[PDB]
Design an enzyme around this catalytic site. Structure first.
Site, PDB file in Angstrom:
ATOM      1  N   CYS A 130      -0.680   2.686  -3.982  1.00 46.80           N
ATOM      2  CA  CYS A 130      -1.352   4.011  -3.986  1.00 46.80           C
ATOM      3  C   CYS A 130      -0.432   5.107  -3.859  1.00 46.80           C
ATOM      4  CB  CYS A 130      -2.661   3.724  -3.133  1.00 46.80           C
ATOM      5  SG  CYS A 130      -3.912   2.821  -3.614  1.00 46.80           S
ATOM      6  N   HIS A 144       0.982  -1.177  -0.120  1.00 44.55           N
ATOM      7  CA  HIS A 144       0.101  -0.249  -0.073  1.00 44.55           C
ATOM      8  C   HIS A 144       0.721   1.264  -0.003  1.00 44.55           C
ATOM      9  CE1 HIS A 144      -4.294  -0.999   0.258  1.00 44.55           C
ATOM     10  NE2 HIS A 144      -3.831  -2.223   0.705  1.00 44.55           N
TER      11      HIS A 144
HETATM   12  O1  N7N Z   1      -2.905  -2.824  -3.416  1.00 46.60           O
HETATM   13  C1  N7N Z   1      -2.674  -1.962  -4.279  1.00 46.60           C
HETATM   14  O2  N7N Z   1      -1.511  -1.678  -4.540  1.00 46.60           O
HETATM   15  C2  N7N Z   1      -3.791  -1.138  -4.707  1.00 46.60           C
HETATM   16  C3  N7N Z   1      -4.651  -0.063  -3.772  1.00 46.60           C
HETATM   17  C4  N7N Z   1      -3.785   1.159  -3.478  1.00 46.60           C
HETATM   18  O3  N7N Z   1      -4.169   1.300  -2.048  1.00 46.60           O
HETATM   19  N1  N7N Z   1      -5.877   0.226  -4.535  1.00 46.60           N
HETATM   20  C5  N7N Z   1      -6.990  -0.020  -3.719  1.00 46.60           C
HETATM   21  O4  N7N Z   1      -7.050  -0.504  -2.641  1.00 46.60           O
HETATM   22  C6  N7N Z   1      -8.234   0.481  -4.702  1.00 46.60           C
HETATM   23  C7  N7N Z   1      -8.832   1.900  -3.965  1.00 46.60           C
HETATM   24  C8  N7N Z   1     -10.179   1.598  -3.510  1.00 46.60           C
HETATM   25  C9  N7N Z   1     -10.409   0.065  -3.626  1.00 46.60           C
HETATM   26  C10 N7N Z   1     -10.491  -0.445  -2.085  1.00 46.60           C
HETATM   27  C11 N7N Z   1     -11.116  -2.027  -2.065  1.00 46.60           C
HETATM   28  C12 N7N Z   1     -10.021  -3.128  -2.623  1.00 46.60           C
HETATM   29  C13 N7N Z   1     -10.527  -3.825  -3.919  1.00 46.60           C
HETATM   30  C14 N7N Z   1     -10.678  -2.539  -5.038  1.00 46.60           C
HETATM   31  N2  N7N Z   1     -10.791  -3.482  -6.534  1.00 46.60           N
HETATM   32  C15 N7N Z   1     -11.481  -2.727  -7.528  1.00 46.60           C
HETATM   33  O5  N7N Z   1     -12.701  -2.196  -7.314  1.00 46.60           O
HETATM   34  C16 N7N Z   1     -10.977  -3.115  -8.735  1.00 46.60           C
HETATM   35  N3  N7N Z   1      -9.977  -2.856  -9.384  1.00 46.60           N
HETATM   36  C17 N7N Z   1      -9.656  -3.250 -10.539  1.00 46.60           C
HETATM   37  C18 N7N Z   1     -10.365  -3.843 -11.597  1.00 46.60           C
HETATM   38  C19 N7N Z   1     -11.999  -4.124 -11.070  1.00 46.60           C
HETATM   39  C20 N7N Z   1     -12.727  -4.713 -12.179  1.00 46.60           C
HETATM   40  C21 N7N Z   1     -14.060  -4.996 -11.706  1.00 46.60           C
HETATM   41  C22 N7N Z   1     -14.395  -4.551 -10.403  1.00 46.60           C
HETATM   42  C23 N7N Z   1     -13.534  -4.013  -9.503  1.00 46.60           C
HETATM   43  C24 N7N Z   1     -12.354  -3.816  -9.706  1.00 46.60           C
HETATM   44  C25 N7N Z   1      -9.417  -1.842  -5.158  1.00 46.60           C
HETATM   45  O6  N7N Z   1      -8.286  -1.944  -5.955  1.00 46.60           O
HETATM   46  N4  N7N Z   1      -9.336  -0.300  -4.384  1.00 46.60           N
END
Ligand code: N7N
EC number: 3.4.22.36
Lengths: 166, 87
Positions: free
Chosen positions: A155, A107
């Site tokens: 992020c 993160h």
């Molecule tokens: O782990 C990391 O490095 C990335 C992280 C940075 O904090 N980002 C995150 O938590 C980001 C920001 C808020 C949200 C939090 C809840 C966790 C799962 C989610 N996933 C999707 O919404 C999602 N992502 C990609 C493609 C999708 C296709 C269909 C449906 C949902 C999808 C996701 O990544 N984030």
């Protein structure tokens, strides 16, 4: 994850790109390449990164298909990360190596990468400058005049990075 | 004794732009890492890391629902880093 099967370069193509503006490559019979992977999936405060093992399977195989020896270190603190980075550079296998790759999957915020003990009250942030300082020619003499690639999957804030238009 | 640059021949590549979020799939995996794999397989034979990472950014150019733009930072590469797969 992904299979990692990379489309090979032919000798006909290899000799075609020959220059003093290309990094030197060592012979495959003696070269010892090193690639390091650090991934944080389980956390105490912030939610768990579900599906992180898929991205480990992809990179660990792709880098191995490029002649590198892969090392995977899971669930570490900022202080644990700092020790592992110093241990990787202190390896004498880099002497008979032409390049290196490093992947960080955790993160993040604007300041840096979060550890497994990070929280809003008591943080565990690792700055990108601390990584560059540990991998430079002062701390790492074995990687002098060699390419050093760094991949970051985290992020950079909280905003969705989008703005509406007509 | 001879002097030498303290920082040289480095390249960093991030999943998103500063003050913004990266998107990760719960079962398929991070969109960025997956796309980096798709490009590295195909273009390692003819393109260098700078040429490859530029193409990676281009596949993210169309924002629909979820938007993320990869960025290349702190570049001190003086030469072309060609991988040459198979050699
Ligand atoms: O782990 C990391 O490095 C990335 C992280 C940075 O904090 N980002 C995150 O938590 C980001 C920001 C808020 C949200 C939090 C809840 C966790 C799962 C989610 N996933 C999707 O919404 C999602 N992502 C990609 C493609 C999708 C296709 C269909 C449906 C949902 C999808 C996701 O990544 N984030």
């Amino acid at each position: 994850g992904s299979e990692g099967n990379v489309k090979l370069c032919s000798l006909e193509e290899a000799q075609r790109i020959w220059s003093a503006e290309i990094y030197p490559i060592m012979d495959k019979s003696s070269r010892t390449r090193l690639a390091l992977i650090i991934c944080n999936e389980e956390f105490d405060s912030i939610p768990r990164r579900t599906g992180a093992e898929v991205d480990i399977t992809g990179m660990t195989m792709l880098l191995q298909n490029l002649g590198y020896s892969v090392d995977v270190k899971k669930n570490l603190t900022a202080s644990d990360m700092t020790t592992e980075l110093e241990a990787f550079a202190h390896r004498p296998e880099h002497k008979t190596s032409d390049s290196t790759f490093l992947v960080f999957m955790s993160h993040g915020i604007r300041e840096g990468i979060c550890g497994k003990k990070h929280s809003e009250q008591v943080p565990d942030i690792l700055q990108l400058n601390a990584i560059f300082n540990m991998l430079n020619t002062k701390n790492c003499p074995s990687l002098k005049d060699k390419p050093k690639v760094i991949i970051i999957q985290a992020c950079r804030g909280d905003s969705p990075g989008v703005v509406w238009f007509k | 004794i001879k002097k030498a640059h303290i920082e040289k021949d480095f390249i960093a590549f991030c999943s998103s732009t500063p003050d913004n979020v990266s998107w990760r799939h719960p079962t398929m995996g991070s969109v960025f890492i997956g796309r980096l794999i798709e490009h590295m397989q195909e273009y390692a034979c003819s393109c260098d890391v700078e040429e490859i990472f530029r193409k990676v950014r281009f596949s993210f150019e169309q924002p629909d629902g979820r938007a993320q733009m990869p960025t290349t930072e702190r570049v001190t590469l003086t030469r072309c880093f060609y991988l040459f797969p198979g050699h």
